[PDB]
Every structure is written in structure tokens, then in C-alpha cells.
Design an enzyme around this catalytic site. Structure first.
Site, PDB file in Angstrom:
ATOM      1  N   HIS A  60       0.891  -1.166   0.000  1.00  7.59           N
ATOM      2  CA  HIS A  60       0.000   0.000   0.000  1.00  7.59           C
ATOM      3  C   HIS A  60       0.925   1.210   0.000  1.00  7.59           C
ATOM      4  CE1 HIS A  60      -3.378  -2.461   1.142  1.00  7.59           C
ATOM      5  NE2 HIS A  60      -2.547  -2.968   2.026  1.00  7.59           N
ATOM      6  N   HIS A  92       2.601   9.117   0.376  1.00  6.33           N
ATOM      7  CA  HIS A  92       1.401   9.033  -0.451  1.00  6.33           C
ATOM      8  C   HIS A  92       1.649   9.756  -1.767  1.00  6.33           C
ATOM      9  CE1 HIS A  92      -0.221   7.296   2.883  1.00  6.33           C
ATOM     10  NE2 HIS A  92       0.400   8.247   3.521  1.00  6.33           N
ATOM     11  N   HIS A 115       4.876  11.231   5.772  1.00 11.51           N
ATOM     12  CA  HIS A 115       4.369  11.277   7.130  1.00 11.51           C
ATOM     13  C   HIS A 115       5.390  10.718   8.081  1.00 11.51           C
ATOM     14  CE1 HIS A 115      -0.080  10.970   5.709  1.00 11.51           C
ATOM     15  NE2 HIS A 115       0.192  12.151   6.146  1.00 11.51           N
ATOM     16  N   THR A 194      -4.597   7.270   8.540  1.00 13.94           N
ATOM     17  CA  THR A 194      -5.305   7.491   7.305  1.00 13.94           C
ATOM     18  C   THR A 194      -5.550   6.196   6.566  1.00 13.94           C
ATOM     19  OG1 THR A 194      -3.236   7.918   6.351  1.00 13.94           O
ATOM     20  CG2 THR A 194      -4.499   9.879   7.082  1.00 13.94           C
ATOM     21  N   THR A 195      -4.780   5.235   7.037  1.00 15.02           N
ATOM     22  CA  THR A 195      -4.871   3.815   6.657  1.00 15.02           C
ATOM     23  C   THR A 195      -5.637   2.964   7.695  1.00 15.02           C
ATOM     24  OG1 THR A 195      -3.294   3.145   5.039  1.00 15.02           O
ATOM     25  CG2 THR A 195      -2.876   2.232   7.236  1.00 15.02           C
TER      26      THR A 195
END
Length: 255
Positions: A60, A92, A115, A194-195
Site C-alpha cells: 500500500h 502518499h 508522514h 489514514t490507513t
């Protein structure tokens, strides 16, 4: 979960019901409404003695993991109480240079978001920190395409070797200080990861000055694959959740 049309963000709620929570992230920051709060301390980022271990493709994102042993890479100050120690960072990016960041500022999207994720030492570990609303502090840093960032260069060149879901490159002695902006002003709001698990345990600090990466450096992120060894090529792009309901909640500003 994943980022596709069938297992993407709009479906996370079926398995992690909290996705419909009171304080989910990302959000969009409207500046013509964040509250300058004269009481936010500065940032005490001490990344002198930060020890990186491995960088990995987990299917991911790619993340770089650090050795969180004594109070060596730590974030203190800001809206924080205690020492937050550094575990890893998330990245991201989008299928083109005008999407990719999770947080938007006044609905504007940057090319990418980095992040650096830290956890509160008072809870003894990452493990027991995430069930607590004050458990993790995450600095989100925006990326704009401009001149290159020399500090990001080692990250963009090792990516050839963590191309598919599951490979790992050894990566020691990377200095997280070569990824930071000049100014440390920020906006802070309480939010989630956020995941998935999407746990509401994060005091988010987003930085206002982005960092410039040359498009050659952002293009390297786009050669990586969601898919594991063997299976058909699913290019890893747009690994970002869209902005979620603010819920009255106020974003305060250091500046």
C-alpha cells in the site's frame, strides 16, 4: 483493503467501521477558518541519533522503519505532552503531479505527502499507544515539484529494489533531517491513521512550508507496484484517502 475502485477508501467502513468516526483523517485545511492559537509551543524535533533499519514495499506504500530504542529521534513541543518517539514514515503520491497528498489546503492537492509517525513513550510502545487518543503524533509534510530535494535522493534510488509488494531493502543511516522544510510552523488537529485500522489516536501536525522535489524524484515513486511477486502488474499510484468530515473540530495554527 487496498486503493482500487472495489477495495478502496469508500469501502473501508465495512471492515473498519471507525472510518465513519468523529475524527478521521485526512481533512482539508481551510485557512480562512483555522484558529491562530498563541500557546502552541514550537517544534522540538531532535533527529540527532535517528537510526533507520529497512525500507519496504508493503503493498500500500513504501515505509522506512527506524529503531525506536532510547529517546533518540523524538518529537517534543507543539501541542504535545511527553516524548514522542519515531517509528517510521508513510509516503502518499498520485497518478499525476496534481493529486497525491492526503490533506488538502483550501482544497489544493500537492504532488505527495510524507508522514513521519511517532508514538508517545508513556505507553511503553507502538502497540499500546494506538488504543489511546494521545498515542501517536504524525508530522505530515507536503511535496511540491520544483528543484530537487538532495536529502530525498537516497530514497528515490533504492526504490528499484522494493518494487513489488513484499520486497525489502536494507537502509541504514538515512537522516530524516534532509526531508524537512526550513520552517516548522504548522496546523494541528486531532485525527486518525489514514490507513486501516483508521484509529483515532493521532495528534496531527501538518507543516505549512512544503518541500520541493524535482519531478524526476516524484516519477520514481510511480514505478513501484501494488502487486506482489508474480501476479499482473498493478502500478502503485494514488495511495491516498480523500479528505474526511471535519465535525466542527478546529484546526489551530502556530502562525
Amino acid at each position: 483493503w487496498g486503493y482500487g475502485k472495489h477495495n478502496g477508501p469508500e469501502h473501508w467502513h465495512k471492515d473498519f467501521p471507525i472510518a465513519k468516526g468523529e475524527r478521521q483523517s485526512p481533512v482539508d485545511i481551510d485557512t480562512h477558518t483555522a484558529k491562530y492559537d498563541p500557546s502552541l509551543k514550537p517544534l522540538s524535533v531532535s533527529y540527532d541519533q535517528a537510526t533507520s533499519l529497512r525500507i519496504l514495499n508493503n503493498g500500500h506504500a513504501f515505509n522506512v522503519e527506524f529503531d525506536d530504542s532510547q529517546d533518540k529521534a523524538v518529537l517534543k513541543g507543539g501541542p504535545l505532552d511527553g516524548t514522542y518517539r519515531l517509528i517510521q514514515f508513510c509516503f502518499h503520491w498520485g497518478s499525476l503531479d496534481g493529486q497525491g497528498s492526503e490533506h488538502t489546503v483550501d482544497k489544493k492537492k500537492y504532488a505527495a505527502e510524507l508522514h513521519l509517525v511517532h508514538w508517545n513513550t508513556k505507553y511503553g510502545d507502538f502497540g499500546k499507544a494506538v488504543q489511546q487518543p494521545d498515542g501517536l503524533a504524525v508530522l505530515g509534510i507536503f511535496l511540491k515539484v520544483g528543484s530537487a530535494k538532495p536529502g530525498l535522493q537516497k530514497v528515490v534510488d533504492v526504490l528499484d529494489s522494493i518494487k513489488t509488494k513484499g520486497k525489502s531493502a536494507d537502509f541504514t543511516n538515512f537522516d530524516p533531517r534532509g526531508l524537512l522544510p526550513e520552517s516548522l510552523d504548522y496546523w494541528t488537529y486531532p485525527g486518525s491513521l489514514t490507513t486501516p485500522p483508521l484509529l483515532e489516536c493521532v495528534t496531527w501536525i501538518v507543516l505549512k512550508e512544503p518541500i520541493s522535489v524535482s519531478s524526476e524524484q516524484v516519477l520514481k515513486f510511480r514505478k513501484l507496484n501494488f502487486n506482489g511477486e508474480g501476479e499482473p502488474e498493478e502500478l502503485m499510484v494514488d495511495n491516498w484517502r480523500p479528505a474526511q468530515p471535519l465535525k466542527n473540530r478546529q484546526i489551530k495554527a502556530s502562525f
